[PDB]
Amino acid sequence: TTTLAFKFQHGVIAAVDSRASAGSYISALRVNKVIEINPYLLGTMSGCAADCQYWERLLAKECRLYYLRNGERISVSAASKLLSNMMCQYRGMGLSMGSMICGWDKKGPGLYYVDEHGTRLSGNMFSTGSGNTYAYGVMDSGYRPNLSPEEAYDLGRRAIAYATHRDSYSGGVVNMYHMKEDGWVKVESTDVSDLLHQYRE
Amino acid sequence: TQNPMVTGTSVLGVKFEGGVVIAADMLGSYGSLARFRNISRIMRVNNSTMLGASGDYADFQYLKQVLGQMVIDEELLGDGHSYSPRAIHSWLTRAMYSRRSKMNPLWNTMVIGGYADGESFLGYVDMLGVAYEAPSLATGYGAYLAQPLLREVLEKQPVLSQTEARDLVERCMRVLYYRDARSYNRFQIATVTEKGVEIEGPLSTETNWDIAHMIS
Amino acid sequence: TTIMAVEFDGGVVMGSDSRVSAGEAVVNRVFDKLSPLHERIYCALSGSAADAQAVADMAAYQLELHGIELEEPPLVLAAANVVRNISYKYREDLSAHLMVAGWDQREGGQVYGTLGGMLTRQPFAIGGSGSTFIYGYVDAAYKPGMSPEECRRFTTDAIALAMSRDGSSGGVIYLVTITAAGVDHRVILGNELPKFYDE
Amino acid sequence: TTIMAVEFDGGVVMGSDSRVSAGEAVVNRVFDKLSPLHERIYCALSGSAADAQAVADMAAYQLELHGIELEEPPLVLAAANVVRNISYKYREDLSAHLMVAGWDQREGGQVYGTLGGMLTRQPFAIGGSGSTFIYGYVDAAYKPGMSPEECRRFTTDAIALAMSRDGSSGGVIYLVTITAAGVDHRVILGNELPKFYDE
Amino acid sequence: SIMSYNGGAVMAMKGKNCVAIAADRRFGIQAQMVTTDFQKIFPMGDRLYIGLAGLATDVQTVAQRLKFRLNLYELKEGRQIKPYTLMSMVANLLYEKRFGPYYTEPVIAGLDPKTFKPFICSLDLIGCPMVTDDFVVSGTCAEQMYGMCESLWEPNMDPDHLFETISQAMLNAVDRDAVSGMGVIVHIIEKDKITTRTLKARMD
Amino acid sequence: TTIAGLVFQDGVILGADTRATNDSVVADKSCEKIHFIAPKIYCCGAGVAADAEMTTRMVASKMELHALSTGREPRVATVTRILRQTLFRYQGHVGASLIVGGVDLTGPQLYGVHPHGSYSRLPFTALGSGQDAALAVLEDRFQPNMTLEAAQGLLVEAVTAGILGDLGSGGNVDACVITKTGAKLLRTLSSPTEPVKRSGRYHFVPGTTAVLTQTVKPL
Amino acid sequence: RFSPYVFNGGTILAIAGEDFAIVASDTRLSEGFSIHTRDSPKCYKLTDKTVIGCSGFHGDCLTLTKIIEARLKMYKHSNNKAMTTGAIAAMLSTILYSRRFFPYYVYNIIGGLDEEGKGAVYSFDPVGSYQRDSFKAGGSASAMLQPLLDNQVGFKNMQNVEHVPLSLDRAMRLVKDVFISAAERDVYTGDALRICIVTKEGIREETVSLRKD
Amino acid sequence: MEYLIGIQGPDYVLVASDRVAASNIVQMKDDHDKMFKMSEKILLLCVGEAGDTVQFAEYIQKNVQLYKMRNGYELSPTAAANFTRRNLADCLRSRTPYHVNLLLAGYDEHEGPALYYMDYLAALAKAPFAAHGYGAFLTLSILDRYYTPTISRERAVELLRKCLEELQKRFILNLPTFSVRIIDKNGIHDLDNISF
Amino acid sequence: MEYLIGIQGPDYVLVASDRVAASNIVQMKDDHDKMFKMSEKILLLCVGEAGDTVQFAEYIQKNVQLYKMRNGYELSPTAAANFTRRNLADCLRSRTPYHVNLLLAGYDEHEGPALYYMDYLAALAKAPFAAHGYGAFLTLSILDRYYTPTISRERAVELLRKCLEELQKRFILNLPTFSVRIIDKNGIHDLDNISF
Numbered sequence A: 001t002t003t004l005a006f007k008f009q010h011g012v013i014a015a016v017d018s019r020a021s022a023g024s025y026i027s028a029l030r031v032n033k034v035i036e037i038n039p040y041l042l043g044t045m046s047g048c049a050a051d052c053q054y055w056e057r058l059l060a061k062e063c064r065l066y067y068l069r070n071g072e073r074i075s076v077s078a079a080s081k082l083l084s085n086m087m088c089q090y091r092g093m094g095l096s097m098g099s100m101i102c103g104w105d106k107k108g109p110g111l112y113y114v115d116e117h118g119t120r121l122s123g124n125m126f127s128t129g130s131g132n133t134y135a136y137g138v139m140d141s142g143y144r145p146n147l148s149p150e151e152a153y154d155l156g157r158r159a160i161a162y163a164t165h166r167d168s169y170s171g172g173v174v175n176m177y178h179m180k181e182d183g184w185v186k187v188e189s190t191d192v193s194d195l196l197h198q199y200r201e
Numbered sequence B: 001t002q003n004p005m006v007t008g009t010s011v012l013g014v015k016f017e018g019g020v021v022i023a024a025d026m027l028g029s030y031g032s033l034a035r036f037r038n039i040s041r042i043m044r045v046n047n048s049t050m051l052g053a054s055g056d057y058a059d060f061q062y063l064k065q066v067l068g069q070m071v072i073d074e075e076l077l078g079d080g081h082s083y084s085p086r087a088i089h090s091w092l093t094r095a096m097y098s099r100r101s102k103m104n105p106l107w108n109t110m111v112i113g114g115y116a117d118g119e120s121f122l123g124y125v126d127m128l129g130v131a132y133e134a135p136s137l138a139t140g141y142g143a144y145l146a147q148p149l150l151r152e153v154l155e156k157q158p159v160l161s162q163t164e165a166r167d168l169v170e171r172c173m174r175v176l177y178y179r180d181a182r183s184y185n186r187f188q189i190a191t192v193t194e195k196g197v198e199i200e201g202p203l204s205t206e207t208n209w210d211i212a213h214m215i216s
Numbered sequence C, D: 001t002t003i004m005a006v007e008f009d010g011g012v013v014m015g016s017d018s019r020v021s022a023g024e025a026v027v028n029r030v031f032d033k034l035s036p037l038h039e040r041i042y043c044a045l046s047g048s049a050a051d052a053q054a055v056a057d058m059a060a061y062q063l064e065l066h067g068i069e070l071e072e073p074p075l076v077l078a079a080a081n082v083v084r085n086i087s088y089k090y091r092e093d094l095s096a097h098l099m100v101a102g103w104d105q106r107e108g109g110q111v112y113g114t115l116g117g118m119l120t121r122q123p124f125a126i127g128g129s130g131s132t133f134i135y136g137y138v139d140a141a142y143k144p145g146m147s148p149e150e151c152r153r154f155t156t157d158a159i160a161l162a163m164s165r166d167g168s169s170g171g172v173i174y175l176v177t178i179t180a181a182g183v184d185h186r187v188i189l190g191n192e193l194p195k196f197y198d199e
Numbered sequence E: 001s002i003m004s005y006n007g008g009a010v011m012a013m014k015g016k017n018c019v020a021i022a023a024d025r026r027f028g029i030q031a032q033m034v035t036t037d038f039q040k041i042f043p044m045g046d047r048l049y050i051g052l053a054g055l056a057t058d059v060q061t062v063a064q065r066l067k068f069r070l071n072l073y074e075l076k077e078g079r080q081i082k083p084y085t086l087m088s089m090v091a092n093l094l095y096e097k098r099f100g101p102y103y104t105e106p107v108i109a110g111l112d113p114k115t116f117k118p119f120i121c122s123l124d125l126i127g128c129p130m131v132t133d134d135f136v137v138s139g140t141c142a143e144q145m146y147g148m149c150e151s152l153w154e155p156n157m158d159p160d161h162l163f164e165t166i167s168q169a170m171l172n173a174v175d176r177d178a179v180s181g182m183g184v185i186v187h188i189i190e191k192d193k194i195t196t197r198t199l200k201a202r203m204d
Numbered sequence F: 001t002t003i004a005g006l007v008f009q010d011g012v013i014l015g016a017d018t019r020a021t022n023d024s025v026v027a028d029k030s031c032e033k034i035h036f037i038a039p040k041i042y043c044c045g046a047g048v049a050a051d052a053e054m055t056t057r058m059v060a061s062k063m064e065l066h067a068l069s070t071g072r073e074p075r076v077a078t079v080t081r082i083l084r085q086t087l088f089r090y091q092g093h094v095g096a097s098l099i100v101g102g103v104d105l106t107g108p109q110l111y112g113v114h115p116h117g118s119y120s121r122l123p124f125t126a127l128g129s130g131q132d133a134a135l136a137v138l139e140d141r142f143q144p145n146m147t148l149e150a151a152q153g154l155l156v157e158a159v160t161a162g163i164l165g166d167l168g169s170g171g172n173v174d175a176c177v178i179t180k181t182g183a184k185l186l187r188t189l190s191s192p193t194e195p196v197k198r199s200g201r202y203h204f205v206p207g208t209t210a211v212l213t214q215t216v217k218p219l
Numbered sequence G: 001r002f003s004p005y006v007f008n009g010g011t012i013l014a015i016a017g018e019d020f021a022i023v024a025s026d027t028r029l030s031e032g033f034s035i036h037t038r039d040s041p042k043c044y045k046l047t048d049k050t051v052i053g054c055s056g057f058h059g060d061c062l063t064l065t066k067i068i069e070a071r072l073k074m075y076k077h078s079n080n081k082a083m084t085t086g087a088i089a090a091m092l093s094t095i096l097y098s099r100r101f102f103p104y105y106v107y108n109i110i111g112g113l114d115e116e117g118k119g120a121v122y123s124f125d126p127v128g129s130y131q132r133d134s135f136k137a138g139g140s141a142s143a144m145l146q147p148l149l150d151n152q153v154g155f156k157n158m159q160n161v162e163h164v165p166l167s168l169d170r171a172m173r174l175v176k177d178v179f180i181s182a183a184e185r186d187v188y189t190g191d192a193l194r195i196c197i198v199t200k201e202g203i204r205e206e207t208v209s210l211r212k213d
Numbered sequence H, I: 001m002e003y004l005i006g007i008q009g010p011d012y013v014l015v016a017s018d019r020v021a022a023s024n025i026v027q028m029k030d031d032h033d034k035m036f037k038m039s040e041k042i043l044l045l046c047v048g049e050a051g052d053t054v055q056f057a058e059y060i061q062k063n064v065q066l067y068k069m070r071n072g073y074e075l076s077p078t079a080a081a082n083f084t085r086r087n088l089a090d091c092l093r094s095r096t097p098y099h100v101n102l103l104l105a106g107y108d109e110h111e112g113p114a115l116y117y118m119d120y121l122a123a124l125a126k127a128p129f130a131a132h133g134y135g136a137f138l139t140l141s142i143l144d145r146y147y148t149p150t151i152s153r154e155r156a157v158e159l160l161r162k163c164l165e166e167l168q169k170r171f172i173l174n175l176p177t178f179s180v181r182i183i184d185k186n187g188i189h190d191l192d193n194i195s196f
């Protein structure tokens, strides 16, 4: 698994691959890795799967309780911070959860990273998961905050693409959303290897 | 009970037309030693159920006191509802399982047989919560030596007259005497039928050693 | 495993159970634990059955070369010195125990103990895992100056006791009486083992 | 440690060695391993001497409350059910073994075995680390229907055998004969232990 | 597992006078795909290929020592090595390292030099020669190949159906594995010609 | 791997399954186990398959060379002796639990030699993982002086009980009848399993496989 | 060291069509090197629309199915309607995860009909982590049956083949032929086949014989 | 820590390495050279556990020079790579397990340039470009994004400064200056060390 | 890794830290802030195992703010340092061992400035200057060479750039930009981030 996200002039696009591998074996290879919490929240997943599914779904339960109580559509700070508390409670209990909370709040596009330990980071460019570093390399050399949505999308497909090309634990299809001002919209769920042949010729 | 102090050997179970019969030699070991040579490892729970156990023996007596306590509490009501063998089997499955869930496992491998409503039940419950019915069971090394004999014969004849079953149990126990190191020529045979639980024993096993003069 | 030897006037008597067990299921329910080293020198094996066998064979080889080269039957003390040397030189690699017994013109019956590579003549030299259950009986029933039948029925009783209690011992009881006449190999079937208090 | 009990017609006889050793040097060369639980119910301790003592005291407490509350001497089966419960409930924490023996109007002499938390009446219920050396003797010399002197000289012989071989057992041999008359506490000094084959 | 350090699985399969040997092409350290043209199927004659699998260094070392002993054999003899002879040779060679074993699990596929009878065999990492009649596999993803081959194989398939069968076997079998794939190579071994084919595998 | 033996009036008879697993997966379906030692002395193989193969093959060579040397039949005492010295020298690492059998001038002799070197003559035995069932039925039905037919059906009951009653031992049973006259390798005596057919043809027309690169070499 | 998990083998299988959902498993209940029983079907009828498989540690299969059915009657009591397959899937995810620290070691595969009468199969893992697939194997022989189900059902790596909808019969012959392909090779698969078909009409049960050796 | 890198274009091999030899927190040396001139047309790039690198790779250097002095010509780079592969494999299970990762970049007059990889387990694999160290995890995807088989050596250096600038931005270890040599039919050309 | 540093002159405290929050090879963030404004005149500098830092130090921040809202005034820096010392010590043997190294730089209107150290075992020790991380092993001797009790804050910044330039030259980890704040009677002054 390799999962990245960056933000620019026109919002935040989060791209995730779609293979889930039990050790050396490929359990399923069209997994959906990006749990959609609200109409305009977005949290990815990585590491041991059940931790991301349970704790991030539960995160959606907290956000829904908030939105019913205060009626004011919980922000990204409270989201990543609250999931940060769910993780920080079970410190060192073995939870392997590396995830990211994308969204759009009153202050603007808030991109956060929430680690199994309790690490919590705003930022411009992230890339988690077993093949994160490759996505770093192919994102940076080819990142600039004046990218239009098209060049952004192609940049994501290049990032997750080569990230699953050199990696063993990553592949399948690439999901890539576009967290715009009025909420996310799924930009593509593209095959990977076909991309790599479109990029090798 | 992480470690076994006084274990028993394999128990044998086998159905037959109109009742179930099990055997379990009366030995209780302590390591390689055969310390206790006259302990019975087969309980009568009521008119329609009778139980066996390899493995740790102390926990077997805990399940005797608890289990007989349950059936006595239930006989107290006098409401006509008594635990069929399926209920007792499921209960031991749950107690054994829960004790496993606490990592305080009862080190038994029990084999509950009973006969209620003309249907011969024969259960199995080992320490870890495994459970199932079967026409022929054998805990311990009995699952290695006597088990192939029983599934061989039942394969040859899935419905057995009572005496044919009894000879099959006697002959399996002959094999266990010859080959199982923790065995001993002193075993009970329990028969549960329409009439009720009858525990014959201590029995013994004739043994042949003609091969002992063959080596030359 | 319960092998036993006894010294009486004309010779010895080497009883031994006839089971070799692998863990909790037996592999061989008849196994002669008395392999000859010469015409009148038996070694009662125990422990690692493979290791005991290799020691019995090597010892038989050296005892046979030394046997022919002198042209006279090798004294039992010689045999227990070669089995003692081979059991001591490899003591980290052999879990063997060999109560080597026999007869010889110069000394008569002998039963040398060779656990761990040591050498000690003894009246009755019982060994094996079941031997830890019959020390009481043998101490209570051993009287020096035993006639041969007393030795044979004696060791049969003792190994019978060990067989009833021990799991590492069962089957039949082999008995051989080594004297100036020769070896008299006998077998005790499970229907003939003298019954003791069974409960 | 070698404690032993025997059942005969009028009552029982609880022999026991009198050494408690710490590793290879002894701590106490005289120690009564027979602590009364009631007027006529002794428990022969073994294993963790501290644990066995705590077990004997708690069991004596419950047996005394239950004793007075019924206003009748508590049956031995009661006692071995309370010591059985306390030995089973703590079996991961107590290395104890308590051959609880005694007398009672309703059943006469009894000797219940309670190793590991189990309950089994037996004719002679020997225990302790030295008990692994006298199974042979007791099996060869036990005949049901023993007169009291036969039981006393018998257990004295048996524990004598265990004392000669075992390092965990030595000293004097305590003997008590529990019957309807009462307890008859006796001691066997080291100069009176019946001598057996010593070599 | 030392075997799955590089990953990769090779199978052979027997037809009607032609045995086809496959292999994946992903030379990778544990999770890092490093190379996509790593050779695993080393020829040992005009019609005899010995596909190896496992740790890379034992792949190349066993292949090169085997080619050593095989050139010495063919020179010192007057003949190409018969497949059964080659099998006993490789089994001897792996077995000389009985306690320091080469982590290679070779499969040998080829034809008789004279009669041209099909031949295969797989071996374990200490040399238990296991001649078979339907197929063999070897490597980190053996199980998927046992499924696909055991379901797809049929008696007496000519070369072309053979390439279809072994094709789909390798494709499906490696796509469900993480540590293998990155393409597939296939060799058909007829009586008269030898076709090399690489396959379109998932590049991810 | 469930191999067994037996001894009757005329000679011995060795059994053997035909399966060999790879740690969870049935690798072979027709692996041989009654190997060759001398013209009438056969050696079954259990345990580490590579080590039974190599060991019994080496000893096969020494008995062939010896057999030309003495100008005589090889005696099974020789085979068992070289086998257990070879096995003993390695200190049990060579987990090759042979069961060697044959027919000498002394008579039919069914030895059994375990991985450390401990051999033991005996009239019936069964090694391997299915030694439980095989020992069971052989214990239950063996008799001194059996007919060769009763021996064949009996051993087949034994190795059969191993086949059905064990995991790592399946396929067909192989029994080899040895007698003073000679050896007859009764390959694939019984075949309990029948699952050999199917009902789903899985064919793909040529062209369904996407080929990238190609080449052909004439020979 | 007391070990609380043992691999009692036995493989399950589940497929989803346009209107049905088969679930199948072998009934060999192996352990170590023996066969406890050649009959212990690993599919448990949960409701009229939901047939749940369980492989792996047999004890946790029993406990887990018992807990599930208890939760179904709790749900039916507090809500006056049986759980759909969706709810059963999510609830079995929180059951399997609420023991995240001492797992239920039981590969579930819940197949059944959602409220739209269409197939749905929720393959799980021992610590929760579910998903909805169109086909799935699990247990001992998952690795030998999964690729062939990709092939004849997912039609992957094919060229010039019409991706025809999965018909009930062809799904049947796929199930039986693949379990035979496993019985030949997997040691833990065999001795029977328990194929349960799910449709709007109820649950019809079908069994098949396999290799016993 | 230590980062090799090598790219193989039409007619050359542009290898680059880092110039730090650390001791557990402190760069003891920032002018160290990790490229060992085998012969007129063969560079050897060794990184890994200290002691193994210098000892091993100088052993290979001396064997190659010996070959040239024995026979008047040099090993073709395939031969040298399979040779070092022989020693590293034969020493893989031996008394002295050398933990070195290599790249033996070379150019032959006949076969053309080739860039041999080698993990520390003696796995040999010709590749059009490679890397080592943790910096490989941040650069190889960059080379994949920008590599083309007909890349010109100027474009090669531009690419290589994109990779190395990526290390200076993102990679965690202080790697300040990098050695960079090119190899063509004219031999070795010690090009200008990249700094930051 | 993470490098705090603090110097305490006549009337201030000039603390500086690094701005990297890594994950095992890659700087995931180069604009992270390790200085947590306690109150108007108290900075808290926390480094160490992730999760412990933010959770713990925000706990301390909230208790201090709570104190000010309860009583209308702020904790004197001695009181705050001994308070965080209380929680870290009481949590040292508890269910939650927080592995944080601190420096709670402060200036009181009365007692003057003081720079409290704290290893992760709750050992409190006022010092005229301190450090953490492996970079302490390369800077504290520099501060010893250049420190003087009457150092002016300009001279303080000059010194501090000598230390940090030493890290950029010698220390092994890529620490590119450093936060630097000063504290005097006028409160906190977010000074210009040092880069390289």
Ligand SMILES: CC(C)(C)NC(=O)C[C@H](NC(=O)CCc1ccccc1)C(=O)NCCNC(=O)c1cccc(-c2ccccc2)c1
Binding pocket: A001, A019, A020, A021, A022, A023, A027, A028, A031, A032, A033, A045, A046, A047, A048, A049, A050, A052, A053, G103, G123, G124, G125, G126, G127, G129, G130, G131
């Ligand atoms: C394909 C299906 C639907 C079956 N799930 C698994 O196999 C899940 C898969 N989980 C397991 O095998 C459980 C192994 C396990 C055994 C015993 C105790 C604890 C765990 C797993 O995730 N293995 C790699 C770790 N996790 C991931 O690599 C990962 C990363 C990002 C997302 C996901 C993911 C989450 C939900 C759905 C799909 C994917 C997984």
